[PDB]
Symmetry: D2
């Protein structure tokens, strides 16, 4: 049994709350450790540590700040196997999934190496007679980020890389479900040459989150998670006068046109639907074949691929898919699957009976596939976040388009087609922030930016890319002239 | 007596609430007209009108959208006299001030002529193997803007020019104190070739604003006004999931170093302290001379010039200054002046007695100058928004800098000095968004961006400049590839 | 008979060389006027004028400079018919063509209205300890532009709009074939409020070009014309230490894939092949159908449309196409046509017979269409610049792509297809600067940039867009710090 | 001469010998002795390097930007690991101190750091609905194969200036470095291979004018970048353009420091010592002219400078306390000595005379003592000519306008500096001067890797600077696509 505390001022520390939460191993269903839940006083200590450290860090030139990230990237590559094992053991996903998690975080770190260029502001000479005008992008001061269970490496680095690169200090409040990676990341930042107090990790639940939102020394909050919590963090942050960016849930659709490469479409669906047991806000949860023949041919190819998925713990490196994160998630998913049957959807692949020998207590659910799903059913309206894929049969292109158009969620969407007209038209019109053309998971790369539309995000600036530099800096504008003096 | 309604769908329309507010001529103190206070039906009609028109507007190419602003700029020039007259008549400020108000709005309209270039997004070829990745900046849809009494031309234009250039529809809720100019602007947009429904004006008070904040079809809200109301709007907009940018109050300081051009500092203090009867969020309301000799010489120069300010109605074109906007504002200012005297400050120029013959009921206050002001006084802590300049004597550079630094407000600040070290150091350290070096009112031009720090703004994007374009657009990122086909 | 001189220092002035050049009315073959050919002395006078005015102009703020362009755009709209008339009368093209010529130049003027944003440079705070680093984009001084016969409005404006917006003085040496428009444009710039001497027009031939290339006070040269002369001007300018951008000839191919809309492609070929009598470096001169059926079906649709082209003077407002610019041009084209026949190509529409009643001395040639053209033929290798379209039957996709790939010219190219894969692959791989997907004449808009590859351009910066702002400015970088002074 | 080493070329991931059997001698300038030789490329040697580049470039251009950037991240780490070795070989051929050599390498390293951001930097522009259903977008694609010609004084920094953005952008690159000190460039190319760059993407071709002409007339090389003297820059620029190539060339300097009466004179004098005599003045950003304003400023400045010039520690790279080493060649030494003589015979006052200086045990080294001239006027050779040696000239200016007009009127416009406390004087001076790089209380205003380097007037040719975003522009060509679709299977 291991006990995680917090990471403050360069050290792992125990905290003072007398509160803990259990860390499970979701493959066995057993408790493997605890994590401390920060009190308001523990949060205050992290803020005071960030306050004491931030000015010297902001006073370090951009090139030197960038060198910390360069060093950190090498450390990540050096510590990859260790990081992935601790991630998988708490989260449930495969070693390869876990490495992908780390790698996508690493890529934001690579991006912020370019902070000297990225943080440039604008200069105008002769805005008026002898008058120059120029901006400067200065740190906001102290930022905080709140992250979900599914990417405990990538999403923290999404936020802390640009925030710290811009010369802010940063308080990370990660998911209490799987907190080993975030602490290890902050430890590695120290090893990379980051001053103590610039990246603090404060573990906790709602209590720690409320403490962050109400602290008058925190300037900016970044959130990734479910839509209901995203709304609450966004509204509350604003109510406290802070800047905020929040990113929510999804029900990503893949539309399949009759001219599409059906083999590639089926392959994309198995990976996008069932990768990480469907625990992704960019999982494809709805497949929309256009026309009966397309549906039938696609289902024909897809069904066997779902049935032959290898399910197992992270120690089995041959497995395609692991358990879901908690018993609660398991039960919530199972209840949703039952509602699908009850409401008239056809469960073509039924995974409810799956048990893994030796792991009967793990949070394991077999792959599920529903056909004849309709927009009024719960399995369609609700983000399931499990290995459950729904097929809605569309009669034509306009009908197919209107499905993701009309959904509450607008995170990601995909269209599979050979037709340039269909792809252009669909990607132009859809009210969804991230679009795949023959690409099933259209997550933009670290140097572009990430953000959904509709109920999938709140605020006006995305994750990473240039948007992140904007979010973590305040603009100062100077207008400048001089009286005539000694030159005359 | 005139009776202003709303401007919805290309025309002037009567309100349907049955409630009006009184429009005063501040120079005589009598009612000259009324303005309707929008009901929910009024806002709903404005939203429906916007919804009907926005798609075809967004589908118009950027160069064609730009040509509308082209035309509009010419129409503003042609109608300059008429616009200035109606502005001054309701506001109080001089015709010259009213032209300035309009022209600074006009310059945002010129800036957005560049919308084809401004709206460009980013393309990457070969992000992956055969994969291209690119963003598009699309309209948010329908936006709203809430504006204050003091600039009913400029500030409406600040918001609606980029909002509309970006392909959005825009609902203006201007100050009910002086709503003539806003309706006339919407009318001139129609004459410029703007489609009906794209710029709508809904007049009203807290009622209209709350309707705007809670209407599910408005995506974005921009606010300029007092800090308390900015706090409210920012929080409420966010609680409803909207993007928001809010800009608040001020207590702008000018620091005068002993090496400064004192003649120019003193002239700048007359202009910035007493222009518009001090009714500006970029008015200088604190003069911070460094050293006794600097303070005493500055007082020597200011006294005769504050005393000789010519005060009068807008029909008097020699007047340096007009009346304040309402009886309420006047009483608030006079009350704060009294507290200055009560709390020990030295009223070296007393304008309390000033009366204008023929205009005995107008809201006229003579220029006031306080010396020996300290930071514990009400006249120092509170934004007065009137013709009251306070002098706080600092002993050295560090004492002087700490004054605007510790202030609750952080809109603008100025430093007067011949010394490059003092200027650079001051501009770099001060926690204030807009800094002037030998410039009294460092309002950036339309092509740079406007926004204060601390309690002077909320959100993460400024007014106009490229910030505004970011605020009025949402980012869509497409990831794109193709299966082998007919080319093979 | 009319006599054109030069436009120097705000005035139409006479040439002092005594040498003149004939201006033809291509529709009748008669001489309608003469244009002065600049001496070395005439050029020197224009440079002395430019040198005298540029400092004051560069000292004018970017908003004021932009306003000149705003007024100019209105003056162009006001004078459209007169401009188009003088253009068509000297060039030969239709009024509608001439209006397009002027409009596209007008669009560059609209783009440079945004010069205050476009000319921004970069700022870094704390590049070192207490050290700031920032660039300024300042004028190059005096530029020159050399332009060809076919777009005597658009091309001059391409060059002088950004040159002048950037704070430079500009010397235009337009084509002596049709010099009425360029002078009128200079005159209108004056009316728009441009100071005298900022835009001078120096008419002439090689003599004037050589005088520009060897004048020590001209910093930069822009050229558009034939490849042989672009090569000469690029080399000579550089041997004289000038910066240079030169843009050359073309042999634009259109690839028609078997899945293309053949109606649309044939219609596009008529406009792009025969518009302006094919006197465009973005004209399609080679059609490349893929497959036997595609070629046969295409030839079939084209023939009746080529046969029924309406050919007349600009005074016949029903005409689709006018005469070519000179008898020299006409003899060259006819000579090329004959070479096509003798080299084995099938002439399926023979325009050689064409004569127009009452216009027997006009430079009229009927539309020509060849089939079975192969890469070894002169009509394939040589830019014809006449109404002669060549069809090259491709067997497959790779064969079709290799045709424009291997051509010495690489100005524009187009692919007609419904297939995303084919479109993307062709566009990505082709060694040609301007690529159309279902667009026959992919000339970028003013806010993007123009320029070919291979033999079609020389230098490292394109015409208009942000490229042009880069070409007409030089970068200065300031590194700045201050010693400890009075602030301490 | 002892045991000499022999450098050839670096082509396709390997050191290879020259096929011309012509060599150039490599000296140790501390001793004056030959220590090795370098091969001078034939046309065939260059042709081999171009063919090498041609075969390899397409696959490298097809590698995604993030993967290209990682080669540079690894390379940066390799530079740090090999810093001491790299500095040693540089100093031994060039003359400058080990610390100088490390700064040379570090500034090259900083360009490699900047091009790690190539994925963001290479982005192009997109417009939706430029017309009805019509989209318009650009792509920045490789030019193909570039070449760079570099001078003796920074054989690490300058090659990296050029090859880092060229290679990050997806091109292959042929470096032709100075034959004076060719060890570093080849070792850099070796380290690029060790960092994972494919063979043939960075080739090094050693040689003289012959190799340069072979570069300038090779039809497969699309772009040339040159840094060196103004006469050769003119030649490279013109000839490149004659051959249809794009080119950017960077030339000589005569950098002035203007000292206002209100300046921190002690900081100015200290700055002049470093900027005037660092690397024995062999820098195109060395201050070679001081311009004090007014009598007292001049007299006091001179008085400060004299004993600091006199007490400079001069020695070989093996003496780690030296401020300055020998100049690069015998030729360079003779030319510096001729120019010093010219100053005396044309009337300048040689207040510190370094002509006599000899170092015990290094009598044949190219060592010259620090020199300082007062009462220099604009008609003298020491003023008009770039000396490239440890010779500082003091021109007395009576006022601000006169002080400003000296760098204004000079043929060269590489760098300039103004020392003052006055915001007005600095702003005005920096705004008006016709010189590309300006220091305000900064003696050597060389911009950082993420900004850009370029002089004005005679100091540069072309329209794009070195490094910064300019370099990304220079190493890419713009393609624009205009795109629409006909009614399809969606209808
Ligand atoms: N350009 C400038 O000078 C400038 C810029 C920013 C802010 N300001 C600020 O404007 C203020 C004075 O103008 P004002 O009196 O019009 O400001 P205000 O805050 O009273 O009103 C601004 C807007 O909010 C609305 N509003 C007022 N009370 C409300 C309530 N209780 N609930 C909801 N909405 C409400 C008003 O109708 C008006 O449209 C000063 O504090 C000043 O700093 C001025
Ligand atoms: N950062 C810097 O310090 C810097 C920057 C730019 C320029 N410089 C300049 O470098 C110059 C000194 O260096 P250098 O002596 O190596 O310069 P150089 O001009 O003699 O040589 C530069 C390059 O050109 C080649 N070359 C020389 N002569 C040639 C000819 N006749 N034809 C073709 N190619 C030829 C050389 O082989 C070498 O690679 C100074 O003028 C200085 O201003 C220095
Ligand atoms: Mg297949
Ligand atoms: Mg398997």
């Amino acid at each position: 049994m291991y006990e995680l505390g917090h990471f403050i001022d360069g050290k792992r520390v125990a905290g003072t709350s007398g509160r803990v939460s259990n860390i499970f191993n979701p493959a066995t269903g057993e408790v493997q450790g605890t994590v401390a839940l920060a009190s308001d006083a523990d949060l205050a200590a992290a803020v005071e540590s960030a306050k004491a450290a931030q000015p010297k860090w902001a006073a370090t030139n951009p090139q030197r700040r960038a060198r910390v990230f360069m060093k950190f990237v090498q450390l990540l590559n050096d510590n990859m196997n260790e990081l992935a094992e601790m991630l998988s053991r708490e989260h449930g996903k495969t070693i390869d999934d876990a490495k992908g998690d780390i790698v996508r975080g690493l890529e934001v770190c690579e991006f912020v190496i370019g902070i000297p260029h990225l943080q440039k502001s604008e200069f105008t000479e002769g805005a008026g007679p002898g008058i120059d005008m120029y901006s400067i992008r200065q740190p906001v001061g102290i930022g905080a980020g709140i992250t979900p269970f599914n990417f405990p490496g990538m999403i923290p680095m999404w936020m802390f890389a640009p925030a710290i690169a811009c010369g802010n200090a940063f308080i990370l409040k990660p998911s209490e479900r799987d907190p080993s990676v975030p602490i290890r990341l902050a430890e590695l930042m120290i090893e990379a040459g980051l001053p103590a107090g610039i990246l603090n990790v404060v573990n906790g639940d709602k209590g720690a989150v409320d403490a962050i939102l109400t602290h008058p020394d925190i300037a900016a909050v970044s959130f990734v998670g479910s839509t209901p919590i995203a709304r609450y963090v966004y509204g509350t942050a604003a109510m406290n006068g802070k800047r905020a960016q929040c990113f929510g849930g999804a029900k990503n659709h893949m539309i399949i046109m009759p001219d599409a490469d059906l083999d590639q479409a089926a392959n994309a669906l198995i990976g996008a639907g069932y990768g990480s047991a469907g625990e992704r806000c960019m999982a494809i949860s709805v497949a929309v074949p256009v026309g009966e023949e397309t549906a039938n041919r696609l289902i024909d190819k897809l069904v066997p691929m779902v049935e032959s998925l290898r399910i197992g713990p992270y120690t089995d490196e041959k497995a395609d898919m692991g358990p879901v994160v908690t018993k609660e998630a398991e039960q919530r998913i199972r209840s949703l699957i039952d509602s699908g049957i009850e409401q008239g959807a056809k469960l073509v692949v039924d995974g409810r009976d799956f048990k893994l020998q030796g792991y009967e207590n793990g949070h394991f659910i077999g792959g599920c596939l529903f056909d004849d799903v309709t927009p009024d059913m719960d399995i369609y309206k609700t983000e399931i976040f499990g290995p459950v894929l729904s097929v809605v049969r569309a009669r034509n292109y306009e009908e197919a388009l209107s499905l993701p158009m009309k959904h509450e969620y607008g995170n990601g969407v995909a269209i599979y087609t050979r037709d340039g007209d269909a792809a252009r038209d669909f990607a132009s019109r859809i009210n969804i922030g991230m679009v795949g053309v023959n690409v099933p998971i259209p997550v933009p790369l670290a140097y572009h930016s990430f953000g959904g539309w509709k109920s999938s995000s709140f605020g006006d600036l995305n994750q990473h890319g240039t948007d992140s530099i904007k979010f973590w800096t305040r603009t100062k504008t100077i207008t400048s002239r001089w009286p005539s003096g000694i030159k005359d």
